């Protein structure tokens, strides 16, 4: 039950990353190597070769899209916009992370404004926590009742992927697998 995650025709935004539960079906991990090449393939707490011989209770697959340079933030103990306000991993994370370039699938001349991320928030994010709010962010107690202006900003920003950007700013598709023991 991996093809629908890796070969999905559309991927979710990072601020609303998709989660899929997997349980009750045998999984051949070798199939992952068939979707070559992977820009990053890093596992914490498990040997990639020995996964076929471990029977975990359940698995979770989280999928989203990010910039290339931000890919390093998907790891325990890291910090930044993605790590703080969009997607947090536990310090004792046990699972794998796969990321591959998608410049040919998620880049348009008009600029893909479909693919947003959260800029500012009043507090950090807990591990595997989500937040899909869209109320105006506030700086100063002069209330913003839903009117943009000074200190009243909508807290989402667009990636605006385009074909000509450098590798650092080009889109990357990310899938994170977590196992339950």
């Amino acid at each position, epitope marked *: 039950p991996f093809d629908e995650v890796f070969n999905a025709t559309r991927f979710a935004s990072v601020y609303a990353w998709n989660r899929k539960r997997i349980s009750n079906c045998v999984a051949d991990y070798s199939v992952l190597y068939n979707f070559a090449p992977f820009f990053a393939f890093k596992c914490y707490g498990v040997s990639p070769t020995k996964l076929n011989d471990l029977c975990f209770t359940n698995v979770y697959a989280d999928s989203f899209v990010i910039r290339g340079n931000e890919v390093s933030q998907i790891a325990p103990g890291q*910090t*930044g916009n993605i790590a*703080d*306000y969009n997607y947090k991993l536990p310090d004792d994370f046990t699972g794998c992370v796969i990321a591959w370039n998608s410049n040919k699938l998620d880049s348009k001349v008009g600029g893909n404004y479909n693919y947003l991320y959260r*800029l*500012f*928030r*009043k*507090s*950090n994010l807990k591990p595997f926590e989500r937040d899909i709010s869209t109320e105006i962010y*506030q*700086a*100063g*107690n002069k209330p913003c009742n839903g009117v943009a202006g*000074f*200190n009243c*900003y909508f807290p989402l*920003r667009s990636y*605006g992927f*385009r074909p*000509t*950007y*450098g590798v650092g*700013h080009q889109p990357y598709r990310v899938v994170v697998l977590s196992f339950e023991l």
Partner: antibody
Amino acid sequence: VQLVESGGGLIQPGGSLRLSCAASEIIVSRNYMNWVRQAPGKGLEWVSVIYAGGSTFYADSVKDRFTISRDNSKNTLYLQMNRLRAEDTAVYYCARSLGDRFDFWGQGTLVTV
Amino acid sequence: DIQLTQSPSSLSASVGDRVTITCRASQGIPSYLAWYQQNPGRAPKLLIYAASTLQNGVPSRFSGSGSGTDFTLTISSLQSEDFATYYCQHEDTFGQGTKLEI
């Protein structure tokens, strides 16, 4: 709206000092706060930044020698600078970064070494 | 490590002329570029952001354009109060700076 810096002065070479940027009409614990510096006769140089979530970042050339913090009750920001060099002599500015913009700037304070 | 270079390092013009300034990046970047003004002995003042958006309170005569690796700031008409230093900034990188004269 105000962002006023205080603390700069003549400090001995390698001395330790603390610069306090006091705010008004903005809340330090809510925005992205930045310390920038300008050396006389040269362009601006970004020094350090702190997010509203508590994360901090510094330039690689001055890391482990500076420390950025705040006091939320007093809506103040603080930069502890240790082992100051004449190369650290400059006017330091307290800026609010709003996405990819430094919309609000302070008058800054002079640190001589 | 993306670098920003401004040009010309200095130019002189009379009152009422049209002025153009260029900021060029070492390699192609999105249009996340801002232009700031600074008078001697004063804190820098934001002028433009996104390379085309004018900040509130900025006079309408300032304009900006460009993309890819080259961006430009234009002043249609000068004035006695238009002579100062200008900087182009992207993320955490500031330009070398530019000067204007009467």
